[PDB]
Amino acid sequence: FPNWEFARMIKEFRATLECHPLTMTDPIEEHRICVCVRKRPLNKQELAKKEIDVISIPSKCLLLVHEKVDYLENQAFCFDFAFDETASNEVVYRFTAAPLVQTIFEGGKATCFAYGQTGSGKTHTMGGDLSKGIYAMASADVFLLKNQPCYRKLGLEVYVTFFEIYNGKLFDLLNKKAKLRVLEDGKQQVQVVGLQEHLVNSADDVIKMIDMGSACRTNSSRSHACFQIILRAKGRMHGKFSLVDLAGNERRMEGAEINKSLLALKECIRALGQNKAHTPFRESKLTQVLRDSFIGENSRTCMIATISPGISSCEYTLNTLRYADRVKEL
Numbered sequence: 001f002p003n004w005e006f007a008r009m010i011k012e013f014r015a016t017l018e019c020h021p022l023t024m025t026d027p028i029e030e031h032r033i034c035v036c037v038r039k040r041p042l043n044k045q046e047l048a049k050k051e052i053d054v055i056s057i058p059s060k061c062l063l064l065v066h067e068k069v070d071y072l073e074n075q076a077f078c079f080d081f082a083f084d085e086t087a088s089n090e091v092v093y094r095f096t097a098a099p100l101v102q103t104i105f106e107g108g109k110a111t112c113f114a115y116g117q118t119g120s121g122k123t124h125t126m127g128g129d130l131s132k133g134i135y136a137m138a139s140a141d142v143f144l145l146k147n148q149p150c151y152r153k154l155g156l157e158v159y160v161t162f163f164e165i166y167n168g169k170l171f172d173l174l175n176k177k178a179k180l181r182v183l184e185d186g187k188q189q190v191q192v193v194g195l196q197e198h199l200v201n202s203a204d205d206v207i208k209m210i211d212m213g214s215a216c217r218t219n220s221s222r223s224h225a226c227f228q229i230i231l232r233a234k235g236r237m238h239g240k241f242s243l244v245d246l247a248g249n250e251r252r253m254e255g256a257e258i259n260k261s262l263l264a265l266k267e268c269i270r271a272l273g274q275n276k277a278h279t280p281f282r283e284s285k286l287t288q289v290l291r292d293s294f295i296g297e298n299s300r301t302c303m304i305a306t307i308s309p310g311i312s313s314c315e316y317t318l319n320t321l322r323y324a325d326r327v328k329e330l
């Protein structure tokens with residue numbers, strides 16, 4: 001009843017729109033830079049306040065934003081994958097993090113980020129509803145891949161880390177929120193001093209670590225959480241996957257550290273894209289710690305831009321989409 005016949009126009013547009021959504025049998029794609037969008041459904045509180053759903057997904061790659069002016073104006077965005085409200089964590093995982101698990105076994109570096117406004121679904125995507133969770137699904141597949149004959153030969157051990165970044169400070173979530181320190185040497189290599197890697201022999205051990213870690217993390221909407229899977233051959237690093245649940249991108253309080261951090265990340269992803277010798281890693285603790293993952297022939301990244309579909313979040317949604325749009329730009 002409040003926001004005009006805008007809801008009626010949106011419904012009429014949806015009834016005419018013939019859709020071609022993503023399914024689980026669609027072939028997995030191999031991208032150096034994979035940029036996705038994930039729309040979460042309206043919650044019970046949003047449905048109670050009569051929030052209009054202003055997002056449609058007519059294909060595996062296309063996202064539409066419905067704007068009132070006062071007549072319907074539809075804005076289109078194109079991504080590698082667009083996940084609608086029917087997409088489970090399992091479906092999202094398949095097309096994002098899952099193809100990057102093999103990368104770490106070939107001796108590469110992989111990164112996976114969940115980016116978007118607070119309440120959009122980043123933690124739900126990475127950690128789980130409480131149901132997995134990209135961290136758990138990646139961990140499970142790491143242990144399946146290392147039990148295979150090809151890789152069982154390599155003599156690989158699996159280590160894990162889990163830390164958060166808040167106000168330019170790193171805290172170890174597996175070692176009682178200890179304030180670690182990030183150092184850079186004369187060759188631009190970065191080390192997190194005091195960060196202990198934990199040896200794990202099963203995905204069940206990792207789940208206990210994530211749960212141990214998630215219990216620590218607190219507002220958790222103002223911090224980045226980074227979970228790492230590290231493959232070591234004989235103590236020598238073979239491969240690394242870093243999975244990050246970023247701080248909310250929406251904007252007295254502080255959001256200047258977050259915004260510079262997110263801007264720095266975009267530039268680092270963009271630079272990996274262009275196979276550049278230098279990227280502005282130093283501009284944030286997040287990019288400094290992940291420096292190693294934005295360089296190399298066999299370094300790959302995925303970003304999942306999570307969006308809240310309600311009319312009230314429209315401006316924040318457009319900011320998220322505009323940012324994700326500039327992440328994979330030649």
Ligand SMILES: Nc1ncnc2c1ncn2[C@@H]1O[C@H](COP(=O)(O)OP(=O)(O)O)[C@@H](O)[C@H]1O
Pocket residue numbers: 039040041085116117118119120121122123124125128129221248306
């Ligand atoms: N795709 C989804 N399907 C169902 N519920 C979701 C989905 N994404 C998010 N939610 C729910 O919405 C709420 C907020 O999500 P959350 O992951 O905490 O957001 P964020 O980390 O981006 O701030 C939670 O109760 C969560 O389970």
Ligand SMILES: [Mg+2]
Pocket residue numbers: 122123124220221245
């Ligand atoms: Mg969260």
